[PDB]
Structures are given as structure tokens and as C-alpha cells.
Amino acid sequence: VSQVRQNYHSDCEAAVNRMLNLELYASYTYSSMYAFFDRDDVALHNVAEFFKEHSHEEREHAEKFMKYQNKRGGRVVLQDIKKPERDEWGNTLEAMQAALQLEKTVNQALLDLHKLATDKVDPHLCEFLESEYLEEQVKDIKRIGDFITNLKRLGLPENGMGEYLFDKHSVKES
Amino acid sequence: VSQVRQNYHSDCEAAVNRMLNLELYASYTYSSMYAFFDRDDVALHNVAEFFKEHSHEEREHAEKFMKYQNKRGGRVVLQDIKKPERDEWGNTLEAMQAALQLEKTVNQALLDLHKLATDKVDPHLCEFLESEYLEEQVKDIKRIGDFITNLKRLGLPENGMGEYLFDKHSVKES
Amino acid sequence: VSQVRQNYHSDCEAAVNRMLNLELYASYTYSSMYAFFDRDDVALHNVAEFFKEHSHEEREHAEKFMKYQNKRGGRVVLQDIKKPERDEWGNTLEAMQAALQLEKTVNQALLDLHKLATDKVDPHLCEFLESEYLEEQVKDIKRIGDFITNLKRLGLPENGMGEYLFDKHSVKES
Amino acid sequence: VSQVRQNYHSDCEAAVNRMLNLELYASYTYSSMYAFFDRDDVALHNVAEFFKEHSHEEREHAEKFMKYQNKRGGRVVLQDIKKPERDEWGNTLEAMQAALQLEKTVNQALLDLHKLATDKVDPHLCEFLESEYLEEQVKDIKRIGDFITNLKRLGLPENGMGEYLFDKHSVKES
Ligand SMILES: [Cl-]
Ligand SMILES: [Cl-]
Ligand SMILES: [Cl-]
Ligand SMILES: [Cl-]
Ligand SMILES: [Cl-]
Ligand SMILES: [Cl-]
Ligand SMILES: [Cl-]
Ligand SMILES: [Cl-]
Ligand SMILES: [Cl-]
Ligand SMILES: [Cl-]
Ligand SMILES: [Cl-]
Ligand SMILES: [Cl-]
Ligand SMILES: [Cl-]
Ligand SMILES: [Cl-]
Ligand SMILES: [Cl-]
Ligand SMILES: [Cl-]
Ligand SMILES: [Cl-]
Ligand SMILES: [Cl-]
Ligand SMILES: [Mg+2]
Ligand SMILES: [Mg+2]
Ligand SMILES: [Mg+2]
Ligand SMILES: [Mg+2]
Ligand SMILES: [Mg+2]
Ligand SMILES: [Mg+2]
Ligand SMILES: [Mg+2]
Ligand SMILES: [Mg+2]
Ligand SMILES: [Mg+2]
Ligand SMILES: [Mg+2]
Ligand SMILES: [Mg+2]
Ligand SMILES: [Mg+2]
Ligand SMILES: [Mg+2]
Ligand SMILES: [Mg+2]
Ligand SMILES: [Mg+2]
Ligand SMILES: [Mg+2]
Ligand SMILES: [Mg+2]
Ligand SMILES: [Mg+2]
Ligand SMILES: [Mg+2]
Ligand SMILES: [Mg+2]
Ligand SMILES: [Mg+2]
Ligand SMILES: [Mg+2]
Ligand SMILES: [Mg+2]
Ligand SMILES: [Mg+2]
Ligand SMILES: [Mg+2]
Ligand SMILES: [Mg+2]
Ligand SMILES: [Mg+2]
Ligand SMILES: [Mg+2]
Ligand SMILES: [Mg+2]
Ligand SMILES: [Mg+2]
Ligand SMILES: [Mg+2]
Ligand SMILES: [Mg+2]
Ligand SMILES: [Mg+2]
Ligand SMILES: [Mg+2]
């Protein structure tokens, strides 16, 4: 094994590789949402930029898992990054509903990895998840939920004026 | 078709989607090289950062193709991003040889897309490739070739001292 | 012929004069839209200013063709600038639909001139069009398409509140 | 007991005193390495300064355990600080190998203390270790491993030129 390796279970190493792939998958899905909202027949540019930023966020979190793996003496093993589940995302409400589901999926994977790290008595991995991932995840889930509530308030999917207003007021001006 | 579409052939639209995927593939391969040189048993951190920067460069070029597609009224269609061809990259010389091959592969795809755009009489696509991709590609191929020449000069793969010196002097200090 | 003339076909010279006139025509049409949206019974001042700016843009592009003609040793020949096709433009959606058509007409003329310059083996004229006109044209077509999508979303032509909001949020505050 | 004491087991208090001593021991060993590399017949001054800095780091961590003990209402009990295991450290590679072992020893003691704090249901002690010690420990182990890899690459112990270069490029200039 690696000269640096200490208290790092093979199962945790493998689960870290899986989490890395999941973050890349999430990044790619957000990229797809960006592209959709940038379409001339969709044209909600602040919404598009929101998803672009989230894509970048998830790619950064993937890189953090790569660095983590190497710090512990594990070995990064990459797999294909699967394309997103949809080619088109309907409208701002449908996209935000998909983003909520995606964030909860990622959160469940994080929680499952914490269970594993607990079972293998790895407090370094536990604290890494607790301090670098779990809180920012809850914050993102909360924000997207807040958005969904507002999109429904604004009359989505039927109310185009409401959708237009959301893009101007709820997401940062790009 | 899209209200903005004008003089944009279906074949070109499809080839732009393929080029987008290839850029993402190249980005992912460079990411893998970063991770390798960050390993505790490799530990060439300036080399690692060089590949990290190139990974980011290729992802930016992918995003540029997405924006291009939408500007012309084509539709972004994403496919899986295939994992890199190797899980480990040997040493700085082997990695740079792989990078050279990768850059030439990307360059050939760009040149092939220019042939297609020429055949379909699409000067906007021709100029986009000429002015945004073809020159920066030749510059990257030249830089990597220069590096390979120096790595051979330095006695790679056998000369570890040479490899150490390359990391200190040939690539930016990170 | 002119002492500076080299590789400049008579057909290209004439087509450059025609393109100059078309740019002036486009400028004048945009001027008409400005005047319409400035009317007390229309009164969408940010929309008006958008069209004013585009009028100025097209006049600048006409001047660029004049300078081009002289640089190559051709001779500027002016014709009447025809009045716009309409005296009144309905509403923001109808005007933007007309602007889209106008931009596509100008784009087709540019593409046709590029075909001619290609046929006459004039790479200087080709590059001038490619680098100074074709990309900014695609960008304007994309922007107007995006606007039309949003105007429809906002319920135009019937929804006056939507039209009011477009003027406040989609176009620069004047 | 102390008026401030709450949820602090005697076993944890004692283990904190032992950890304090271990940090002082580690500090003293690093001090010895500094002195060795400062010798006129060794004379690798950047390496020496690296070890001096680590000596200071470990003494600071000892002081942090003293403060911790008092914050919880435990009582600092000091023992002799044992001299280092060697009087001379061979060369940069041998010293770094010893430092790696020392850092792993300290890390194991930290992990063992976390197990104890877990068994005694002391989340304050758990979080103190997690947030103030465990991550910086993994970072130091990684850095020293990276160094060892480079020293081997440079031909240590036989290659004096390699050793000279390491002192100039791998450790901060003092
Ligand atoms: Cl282990
Ligand atoms: Cl294991
Ligand atoms: Cl779909
Ligand atoms: Cl914390
Ligand atoms: Cl408002
Ligand atoms: Cl406002
Ligand atoms: Cl078309
Ligand atoms: Cl077609
Ligand atoms: Cl491999
Ligand atoms: Cl040197
Ligand atoms: Cl130097
Ligand atoms: Cl001529
Ligand atoms: Cl002629
Ligand atoms: Cl009329
Ligand atoms: Cl150019
Ligand atoms: Cl107590
Ligand atoms: Cl007790
Ligand atoms: Cl000794
Ligand atoms: Mg080994
Ligand atoms: Mg394993
Ligand atoms: Mg599939
Ligand atoms: Mg815990
Ligand atoms: Mg926190
Ligand atoms: Mg976040
Ligand atoms: Mg997230
Ligand atoms: Mg997250
Ligand atoms: Mg349509
Ligand atoms: Mg098609
Ligand atoms: Mg495969
Ligand atoms: Mg040709
Ligand atoms: Mg050019
Ligand atoms: Mg150039
Ligand atoms: Mg480049
Ligand atoms: Mg490249
Ligand atoms: Mg390139
Ligand atoms: Mg004369
Ligand atoms: Mg003539
Ligand atoms: Mg008439
Ligand atoms: Mg060109
Ligand atoms: Mg350009
Ligand atoms: Mg323009
Ligand atoms: Mg225009
Ligand atoms: Mg134009
Ligand atoms: Mg008392
Ligand atoms: Mg006691
Ligand atoms: Mg003794
Ligand atoms: Mg527990
Ligand atoms: Mg914490
Ligand atoms: Mg922390
Ligand atoms: Mg430290
Ligand atoms: Mg330490
Ligand atoms: Mg430490």
C-alpha cells in the first residue's frame, strides 16, 4: 500500500471514487440545464447562469474528492460520466424540481458514505464530509425548495409572466 | 426549425455536438493526469497543475461549443463522457506523449469540421474554428512537443533527477 | 483603374455598394421603429432607445463599407435610401419580428457577398466579412430571437402588462 | 472536581496528558533533526529550517492540549520529555523517513484518543480532534510522503547532487 495510508479502508476508498463520479454526473446535468435555458426558444439567461454556476460548483466538489483520495493514499479510479436523464428540461419549475431531486440524491450518497466511514471508524473521513459537504448540501436543497415554492406561487408552468419575473428577481442578474 | 437558424446544416449541427463531447473527453483525460501527478508516489506538483489547467481549458472550449450551437439555432445533444484510456500515466514523458496525441486528435477533429463547414458553405462556422480554435491548438501542440524534446534531453524515463528538474523549471511554479 | 487596386473584381465592388445601401436601409428602418416607440400613444422608451442604438450601429456598418471600398480602390456609388416598409410597427412583438426578418435579410446579403468573394478568389474581402460582420450578425439575430421568445412568454400582443415589463427588464434602461 | 467539569471522563483527561507529552516528544525529535542539518559536515540549511518549523508546530500543538485540559477542568500532569531515538539522522532521506514514522505515530495516538472520546460519549473532545488535529496530520503525512518520493527520484542516499537540489527546490528558502 501507499506509504501515507493509515486507517483508510478499501471500501471507503472505493466509495470515494463513486462519490467523485456522482459529482461529475451532477455537474454534467447542471451543464445541460444551462444549455437548455440558453436556447433561443427558452431564453431565461439568469436561470441559465444559475445552473452554470452550479455545474462549476459540482466539478469543484469532484476535484476535492480527487485531492482527498490522494491525501489518504487511495487511488483515483475514473468511470464514464453518464449523460443527463433528459435532453430538454421543460421550464424553470420542471428544471428546479429535477435539481431538487438531484441534490437529494447527492445528499443521500454523502450520508451513506458517512455511515460507511462510521462503520470503518474513520473520523477523518467523517469530519471531511461533515465540514465540507453536508452543510452546503442542506443549504442548496433549502434554496431550491424556496425557488420551487416561489415558482408555484408565480403560476408555473402556465404563467409565462411569472416565469419571466422569476428570472429577473429570484436569481442573480448575470 | 429555430427562428434564428440560417445557413446551418444539420450535419454541421451534429458535428458540433460531437466536437463538444470530444472536448469534454479531453478535459477528463487531463483531469486524470492531474490526479496521477498529485499521487504521493508520483508527487510532481507543477506537472499536475499544468494538466489541471489544461483540463479547465478544454472544459471552457466545450462550453464555447454549447454557446455556439445555441447561437446558430442548433440543439445541444449530450452523450456520455468516456473515461480516459489509462488509469495511470507512467511518468512525465509518457503523459506528455499522450497529451501530444490527444491534442493532435482534437486538432484533426477541428480540421475535419472545417472541411465539413467548407463543403456546406458555412463561413461563420469556418471563421469560428479559424479564429477561436485552430491557432490555439497549434500553439498547444508546439508547447507539448517542446516539452517532450526537453524531457528526452533530461534523460527520461530513467533519469529521475531530470524529471525533478523539469517540474521545477519547465512548467509554471504552482 | 486606381493605383491601389489589386485582386478586386468589378462584381465585388458593385456588391459592396449594394451592401452599403442595404445597411443604410436597415438603419432607416430602425430609426422608424425608434420614432414609433417614442410616440405619446406608444411610449415604450427603453424599446425606442434599443432601436435608436441599432439604427446607429447600422449606419456605422455602412460607413465601414465606404471605407472598405476606398481602401481597395473601388468607387463608392450611392443610391436612394428607400423608406421603411411600414409607417407604424404595431407593438413590441411585431417590431421585433420585423427586426428579426431584417437582420436575416442583411445576413443573407452578407453570406451572398462572401460567396461572390469566394468565387472571385478575394480572401481579403472574405476575411473582412468573416471578422467584421458575420459574427456580430449572428449575435444580433440570437438576441432578437431571445426577445421574441420572451415577448410571447409575456403574453404579447394582448398582455399590456407584459409589454410594460419587457421595456423595464429586457432592454437597457435609458 | 473542578467547578467547570462536565462530561469529561478521567480516562480522557489522562489520555490528553499523554498526548501532550507525545507532542513535546515529537517537537524535540524535530529539534534534533534541525541541529543535525545545521552541522558543518551536513549543511543543508533549508532542510534544517523545515525541521525547525515542524518543531515549533508540535510545541504549539502541545500548548493547545494544555489549554484544552484546563478548559475542560482537567489537570495538566507533565512527565519527562524523552530524548530522540537517534543522535544523528544520516541524510535527508533517512530523516524524512523518520519524520513520516513519527507523524504516523502521532496520528495513531490521535485516532486512539478519538476512539476513547467516542467510547466515553464526549463529542466536544471528538470535534476538537477532528477539527484541530486530524486534517493537519493527514496533510503533513502527505507532504512528507511526497518528499520521500522525490528524494528517491533524486537518487538518495547516493546522489549528493540530488540531495543538494532537494534543499534548494523542495523546501522553502530560509
Ligand atoms: Cl490503511
Ligand atoms: Cl482495507
Ligand atoms: Cl428529454
Ligand atoms: Cl469544523
Ligand atoms: Cl417587476
Ligand atoms: Cl426591479
Ligand atoms: Cl438553416
Ligand atoms: Cl440541413
Ligand atoms: Cl492503465
Ligand atoms: Cl537547478
Ligand atoms: Cl532556480
Ligand atoms: Cl484588380
Ligand atoms: Cl474586374
Ligand atoms: Cl404602415
Ligand atoms: Cl480574426
Ligand atoms: Cl465530568
Ligand atoms: Cl470520570
Ligand atoms: Cl544515533
Ligand atoms: Mg512505496
Ligand atoms: Mg481496494
Ligand atoms: Mg446510457
Ligand atoms: Mg462524529
Ligand atoms: Mg461548518
Ligand atoms: Mg453549495
Ligand atoms: Mg449541491
Ligand atoms: Mg453539494
Ligand atoms: Mg418557433
Ligand atoms: Mg439534424
Ligand atoms: Mg468504456
Ligand atoms: Mg474554398
Ligand atoms: Mg479571422
Ligand atoms: Mg487570430
Ligand atoms: Mg490552448
Ligand atoms: Mg488543447
Ligand atoms: Mg485546443
Ligand atoms: Mg492614377
Ligand atoms: Mg465595375
Ligand atoms: Mg417607394
Ligand atoms: Mg478567416
Ligand atoms: Mg472574431
Ligand atoms: Mg451587432
Ligand atoms: Mg444587425
Ligand atoms: Mg449586423
Ligand atoms: Mg471548587
Ligand atoms: Mg483521573
Ligand atoms: Mg532514555
Ligand atoms: Mg458513533
Ligand atoms: Mg467540524
Ligand atoms: Mg476543517
Ligand atoms: Mg501541520
Ligand atoms: Mg505533524
Ligand atoms: Mg500534527
Swiss-Prot record, chains A, B, C, D:
It is an enzyme of class 1 (oxidoreductase). One of its GO terms (cellular component) is cytoplasm. Residues 6-155 form the Ferritin-like diiron domain. Fe cation 1 binds at E23, E58, H61. It catalyses: 4 Fe(2+) + O2 + 4 H(+) = 4 Fe(3+) + 2 H2O. SUPFAM superfamilies: Ferritin-like. CDD domains: Ferritin. Its EC number is 1.16.3.1. GO terms for biological process: intracellular iron ion homeostasis; iron ion transport. InterPro entries: Ferritin, Ferritin-like, Ferritin-like_diiron, Ferritin-like_SF, Ferritin_CS, Ferritin_DPS_dom. One of its GO terms (molecular function) is ferric iron binding. Fe cation 2 binds at E58, E103, Q137, D140. Keywords: Iron, Iron storage, Metal-binding, Oxidoreductase. Stores iron in a soluble, non-toxic, readily available form. Important for iron homeostasis. Has ferroxidase activity. Iron is taken up in the ferrous form and deposited as ferric hydroxides after oxidation. Belongs to the ferritin family. There are three types of ferritin subunits in amphibia: L, M and H chains. M and H chains are fast mineralizing; the L chain is very slow mineralizing. Oligomer of 24 subunits. The functional molecule is roughly spherical and contains a central cavity into which the polymeric mineral iron core is deposited. This is Ferritin, middle subunit. It comes from Aquarana catesbeiana (American bullfrog).
